[PDB]
Amino acid sequence: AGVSENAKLIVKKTFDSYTDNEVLMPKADYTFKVEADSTASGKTKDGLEIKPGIVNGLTEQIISYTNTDKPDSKVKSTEFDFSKVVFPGIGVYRYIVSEKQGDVEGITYDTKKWTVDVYVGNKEGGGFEPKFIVSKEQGTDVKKPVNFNNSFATTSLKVKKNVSGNTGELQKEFDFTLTLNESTNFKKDQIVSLQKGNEKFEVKIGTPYKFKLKNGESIQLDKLPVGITYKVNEMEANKDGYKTTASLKEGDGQSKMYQLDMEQKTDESADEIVVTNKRD
Numbered sequence: 001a002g003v004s005e006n007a008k009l010i011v012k013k014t015f016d017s018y019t020d021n022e023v024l025m026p027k028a029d030y031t032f033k034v035e036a037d038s039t040a041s042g043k044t045k046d047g048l049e050i051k052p053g054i055v056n057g058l059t060e061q062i063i064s065y066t067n068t069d070k071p072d073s074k075v076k077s078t079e080f081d082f083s084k085v086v087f088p089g090i091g092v093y094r095y096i097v098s099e100k101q102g103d104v105e106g107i108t109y110d111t112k113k114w115t116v117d118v119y120v121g122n123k124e125g126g127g128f129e130p131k132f133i134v135s136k137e138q139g140t141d142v143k144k145p146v147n148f149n150n151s152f153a154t155t156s157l158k159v160k161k162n163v164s165g166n167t168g169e170l171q172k173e174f175d176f177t178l179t180l181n182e183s184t185n186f187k188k189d190q191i192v193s194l195q196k197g198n199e200k201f202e203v204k205i206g207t208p209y210k211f212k213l214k215n216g217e218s219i220q221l222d223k224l225p226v227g228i229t230y231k232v233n234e235m236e237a238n239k240d241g242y243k244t245t246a247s248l249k250e251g252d253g254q255s256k257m258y259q260l261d262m263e264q265k266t267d268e269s270a271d272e273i274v275v276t277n278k279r280d
């Protein structure tokens with residue numbers, strides 16, 4: 001554990017808190033870098049010299065995910081080949097391995113780093129090569145394979161109809177449309193679950209979803225991706241005597257006006273839209 005007997009270091013990527021198949025994995029890339037440990041000095045238990053790692057020969061490496069990946073396919077890997085480095089002699093060459101901070105909305109990128117000790121011996125026929133690679137969490141003495149853990153947030157949207165006024169028709173059915181738009185990280189034809197009462201429905205990103213609400217009724221999407229846009233529209237707004245007003249409330253914040261059919265970007269605050277249809 002944490003000791004590889006070749007010249008390759010395996011680096012894994014995980015999302016420990018991603019367990020719900022209904023949730024969409026963001027289409028995203030994770031970038032890993034190997035740096036010299038410039039503070040490396042001294043000697044090992046058997047007297048071997050500890051030296052800063054040589055990075056010429058190494059490059060940044062990427063692990064990619066798509067919306068098709070699910071909790072069961074969430075662990076991926078890349079391999080850094082230290083045999084591409086020219087070592088000038090016997091020694092322990094010490095590196096630091098890390099994940100770059102990306103820029104995708106909703107994603108938390110692992111900040112932990114790993115100490116990687118490459119034990120270099122004589123190569124048959126001349127010169128030198130890695131014999132063992134030892135990895136540990138930086139600031140620890142525990143041998144452990146290199147693993148970076150990311151997470152991503154989901155959010156929600158609820159849309160409710162209230163019909164008000166003296167002559168508001170308390171069983172009239174208002175037509176609504178919900179459209180989720182594609183983004184860089186969430187693509188067309190991916191599914192998000194919508195709940196109306198005790199029934200579940202599938203909404204496809206990029207296809208307007210038609211539904212109906214009477215007074216008191218709502219739809220909700222509990223596991224919406226972060227960083228997409230949506231539009232909510234009510235087809236008969238301000239018709240048949242009705243004064244229609246729509247509001248948006250985010251988390252425990254203050255309600256503000258929501259313009260029917262206007263794009264709203266999803267972020268880390270839960271959204272609730274109330275459409276009031278008043279008739280005095």
Ligand SMILES: [Ca+2]
Pocket residue numbers: 155250265266267268269270271
């Ligand atoms: Ca929000």
